[PDB]
Design a protein around this ligand. Structure first.
Ligand SMILES: CC(C)(COP(=O)(O)OP(=O)(O)OC[C@H]1O[C@@H](n2cnc3c(N)ncnc32)[C@H](O)[C@@H]1OP(=O)(O)O)[C@@H](O)C(=O)NCCC(=O)NCCS
Ligand SMILES: Nc1ncnc2c1ncn2[C@@H]1O[C@H](COP(=O)(O)O)[C@@H](O)[C@H]1O
Length: 627
């Protein structure tokens, strides 16, 4: 039972994690789990030696499963289906690693990856892991400036990219965006590796850019390089301002142990089953559950290049699941809301044999009751909300379907996973009564596989995560826990919003808006949206002496966010106001504007400069349709 599992962890955490560590093939096995020598900066399995690519690929070939399918590429936007076995994947990754080594990549070097959803993206991640290089994958929906920030922070020796990708009605110009990002960056890579795609080919800068295939001619395959248990597996940037980059570090050994454990115990698949997360390699869901966890565990994983609707229609999810015999499906609530908007009766579902589909999982944003119940009703399988974040790399709260299918409380991601002692704390740092809203914190040490630190930013790591609640990790989410231990995730406690499942910094957006020549100051809030959960909304205050029309400035701002942050920011609603409501210390009362926009309750702020400002704000919101 799950109570037995969780109590077994509480009563003997070392024994629990050392046993889970037995599933990993070590070069040097760890002698213990927790390393508390640098508390409160805890680390796990630091004395191990291991290689991630060996456990995700080679080992399965050596076990006789070389002909098992490792990766299925299903790209409706290029009408392409490709299957790659574990033996084929071993050949591709070891030769690609050899090419990276021949051009100077060494253990510890960073390699940025800027690619759409193609199997070559996983091969690049795994090749870096094979060399002990440290990859950093950047979502292809980010703009050249955002890619430049990353280049500067991570100082990669190389960047791997594809020529293009396909979005509905638009080709994404990866290589031109990379070119502009490299020009913007102060740090310059030694070389780039460019995977050409026929939909829009790329220009190579001579001496810098090399063709993916040609660079592999005549190279020897590289071996799996042994790295320390606490060697970084990758750097994954999450929501932030250009001044305060948050490069989440993933430690190699805890990552292997924890992700492997989740595949049966949470996602209820056995080795050889087919698993599909409809996410992107640019996100942690794509790191953990497109690339690493299924391959570590010996599953088939699906790399899907398309959309829940429009590539070609709302049946695509069911066609993919049916055709490839998916057993567990992992997606985001926004994607299913799009499907049921187009196909409310689930007519596409009856067209396909879904008899292999056993469980659906949701994460990345609030899983609303309508979406849960529709999906349960139309698929007749359990639908499992579960909560986690870039920092943890795997579930904090879940329904542990491979251990015990617990009763689902619709609206809740269920219960704390082993390794997470989850508590709701008040302003004063004290646990509150069940059902009381507060900040969700996790008692240190955070579970194996979670971040030990931020890339070259230890001070920012301590401040943002370990300081508000000493002895705890501050998740950044607020919510409550009921009397049975079921979690409910409410809002972020910081500037972050979740748009269509995507974690975005509103502060990043304000910094961009604040650089428009005519804007004196601004505020970006996240308003409620039925389809996408939240949407960003901007308020603009012009400088003195601005005559220009208001909507024309608003357009240049919408366009500046798209150019500086990227299309993924989904920033379409900007408006112009005389002034912003502030407290005595000058803080902008963003929380009050949100409640006004959402038509939710609020109390007039107690230290607001001029209350009449909120009437002006209310008029600006009504012009945009809110509420
Ligand atoms: C919202 C949804 C219906 C897609 O529709 P959408 O119009 O693309 O909505 P988004 O907010 O994602 O897209 C915003 C913009 O970024 C672009 N975008 C999305 N993904 C992109 C990508 N991989 N590369 C480049 N641009 C991308 C879109 O084209 C869009 O551009 P537009 O303004 O010119 O139309 C939904 O399927 C979705 O995005 N789910 C989450 C995706 C995911 O990977 N989630 C992981 C969480 S578990
Ligand atoms: N199951 C969930 N329910 C509600 N919010 C979630 C859930 N999963 C993830 N999130 C939100 O998304 C954040 C993680 O984003 P990311 O780091 O990009 O994966 C969390 O901190 C939450 O704010």
């Amino acid at each position: 039972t799950y109570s037995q599992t969780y109590a077994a962890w509480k009563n003997d955490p070392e024994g629990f994690w050392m046993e889970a560590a037995q599933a990993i093939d070590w070069v040097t096995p760890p002698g213990a789990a927790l390393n508390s020598d640098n508390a409160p900066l805890y680390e796990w399995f630091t004395d191990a030696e291991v290689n991630t690519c060996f456990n995700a690929v080679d080992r399965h070939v050596q076990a006789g499963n070389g002909d098992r399918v490792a990766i299925i590429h299903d790209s409706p936007v290029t009408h392409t289906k490709q299957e790659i076995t574990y033996a084929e994947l071993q050949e591709r990754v070891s030769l690609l690693a050899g090419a990276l080594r021949a051009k100077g990549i060494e253990k510890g070097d960073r390699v940025l990856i800027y690619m759409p959803m193609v199997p070559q993206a996983l091969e690049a991640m795994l090749a870096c892991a094979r060399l002990g290089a440290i990859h950093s994958v950047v979502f292809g929906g980010f703009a050249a400036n955002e890619l430049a920030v990353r280049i500067d922070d991570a100082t990669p020796k190389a960047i791997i990219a594809a020529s293009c990708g396909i979005e509905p009605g638009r080709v994404v110009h990866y290589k031109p965006l990379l070119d502009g990002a490299i020009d913007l960056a102060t740090h310059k890579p030694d070389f780039c590796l460019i995977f050409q795609r026929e939909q829009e080919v790329a220009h190579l800068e001579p001496g810098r850019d090399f063709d993916w295939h040609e660079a592999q001619y005549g190279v020897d395959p590289a071996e799996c390089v042994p790295v320390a248990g606490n060697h970084p597996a990758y750097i994954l940037y999450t929501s932030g301002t250009t001044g305060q980059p948050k490069g989440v570090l993933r430690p190699t050994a805890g990552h292997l142990v924890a992700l492997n454990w989740t595949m049966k115990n949470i996602y209820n698949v056995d080795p050889g089953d087919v698993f599909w997360a409809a996410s992107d390699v640019g996100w942690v869901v794509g790191h953990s559950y497109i690339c690493y966890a299924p391959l570590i565990h010996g599953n088939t994983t699906i790399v899907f290049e398309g959309k829940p609707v429009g590539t070609p229609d709302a049946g695509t999810f069911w066609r993919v699941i049916s055709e490839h015999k998916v057993k567990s499906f992992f997606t985001a609530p926004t994607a299913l809301r799009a499907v049921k908007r187009e196909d409310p009766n689930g007519e596409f579902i009856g067209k396909y044999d879904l008899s292999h589909l056993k469980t659906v999982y949701l994460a990345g944003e609030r899983a609303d009751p309508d979406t849960i119940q529709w999906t349960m009703d139309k698929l007749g399988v359990p639908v499992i909300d579960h909560w986690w974040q870039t920092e943890t790399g795997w579930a904090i709260a879940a329904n542990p379907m491979g251990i015990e299918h617990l009763p689902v409380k619709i609206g809740s991601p269920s219960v704390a996973m082993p390794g997470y002692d989850v508590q709701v704390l008040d302003e004063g740092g004290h646990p509150v009564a069940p059902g009381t809203l507060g900040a969700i914190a996790v008692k240190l040490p955070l579970a194996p596989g979670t971040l030990p630190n931020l890339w070259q930013a230890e001070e920012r790591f301590v401040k943002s995560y370990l300081t508000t609640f000493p002895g705890y990790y501050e998740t950044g989410d607020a919510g409550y826990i009921d009397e049975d231990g079921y979690l409910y995730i409410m809002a972020r406690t910081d500037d972050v919003i979740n748009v269509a499942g995507h974690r975005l910094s509103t502060g990043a957006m304000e910094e961009v808006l604040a650089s428009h020549p005519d804007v004196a100051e601004c505020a970006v809030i996240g308003v409620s949206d039925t389809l996408k959960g939240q949407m960003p909304l901007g308020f603009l205050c012009l400088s003195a002496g601005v005559n220009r029309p208001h909507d024309e400035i608003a357009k240049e701002c919408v366009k500046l966010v798209r150019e500086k942050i990227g299309p993924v920011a989904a920033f379409k609603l900007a408006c112009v106001v005389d002034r912003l409501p502030k407290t005595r210390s000058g803080k902008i009362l963003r929380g009050t504007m949100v409640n006004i926009a959402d038509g939710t309750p609020w109390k007039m702020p107690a230290t607001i400069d001029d209350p009449a400002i909120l009437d002006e704000i209310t008029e600006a919101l009504g012009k945009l349709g809110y509420p």
